[PDB]
């Protein structure tokens, strides 16, 4: 996702899915990689401490000045047309300078984007409609002209472009938190279970302190974490040895 040679276009972006694996987020700060790393919904440094169930990464390339328009609540020809994040979006956004690679001579036509649309697109939706954008009352008849423009345009990429006009490889990091068991977590080794003693327990992402004993409750085959009338933690299911 991050180190891939070529990403997809932001007009239609490839979403790579990562689940059931070991995610090492410490290697990022151990070996410097991301040039621009910022997290809107979470902290930049807390990805390693807390781990998530499913990971969703959208790899795409956009112009420099177009990076700030991808974020919850932001507006622009990107957020409002091709790629839109939801207002409640919780995740991270990464960017770095590929200009010495992606840029070819006068331009690169492999990365394209929607420069025009007749409305505001919904978040997490890929619109393949090529319909000519009509700004005025003149009928376009499916061709360019006065107040008639083709919505999908290609990014100008050149080695001589300025910091704002140079390409930056962008990858949006989305995740699912506490909606399922955690299949993506770092090298955290499981230890032996302690009973009849007060201990600090971390079970399938549930952290807390309490005495661990054998419960008389009978969970159904699909049930996992029990809770009392107070909606607190009553009994839990050990994900390793059931």
């Amino acid at each position: 996702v991050f180190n891939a040679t070529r990403f997809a276009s932001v007009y239609a972006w490839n979403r790579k899915r990562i689940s059931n694996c070991v995610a090492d987020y410490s290697v990022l700060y151990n070996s410097a990689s991301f040039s621009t790393f910022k997290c809107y919904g979470v902290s930049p440094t807390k990805l390693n401490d807390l781990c998530f169930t499913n990971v969703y990464a959208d790899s795409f390339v956009i112009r420099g000045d177009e990076v700030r328009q991808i974020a919850p609540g932001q507006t622009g020809k990107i957020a409002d047309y091709n790629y839109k994040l939801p207002d409640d979006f919780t995740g991270c956004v990464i960017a770095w300078n590929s200009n010495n690679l992606d840029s070819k001579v006068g331009g690169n036509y492999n990365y394209r984007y929607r420069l025009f649309r007749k409305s505001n697109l919904k978040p997490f939706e890929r619109d393949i409609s090529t319909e000519i954008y009509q700004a005025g009352s003149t009928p376009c008849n499916g061709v360019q002209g006065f107040n008639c423009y083709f919505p999908l345009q290609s990014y100008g990429f050149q080695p001589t472009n300025g910091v704002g006009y140079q390409p930056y490889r962008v990858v949006v990091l989305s995740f699912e938190l506490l909606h399922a068991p955690a299949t993506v977590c770092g090298p955290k080794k499981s230890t032996n279970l302690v009973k009849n003693k007060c201990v600090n327990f971390n079970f399938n992402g549930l952290t807390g302190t309490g005495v661990l004993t054998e419960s008389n409750k009978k969970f159904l085959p699909f049930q996992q974490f029990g809770r009392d009338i107070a909606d607190t933690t009553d009994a839990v299911r050990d994900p390793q040895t059931l």
Binding site: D228, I229, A230, T232
Partner: peptide, 29 residues
């Protein structure tokens, strides 16, 4: 009149103090 949420309350820091005079001492009076 009936004098479990109680167990859950004590987990959040809720405590119930015992009475000084028991129910038997009340019967003595």
């Amino acid at each position: 009149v009936t004098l479990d949420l109680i167990c859950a309350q004590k987990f959040n820091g809720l405590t119930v103090l015992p009475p000084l005079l028991t129910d038997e001492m009340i019967a003595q009076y």
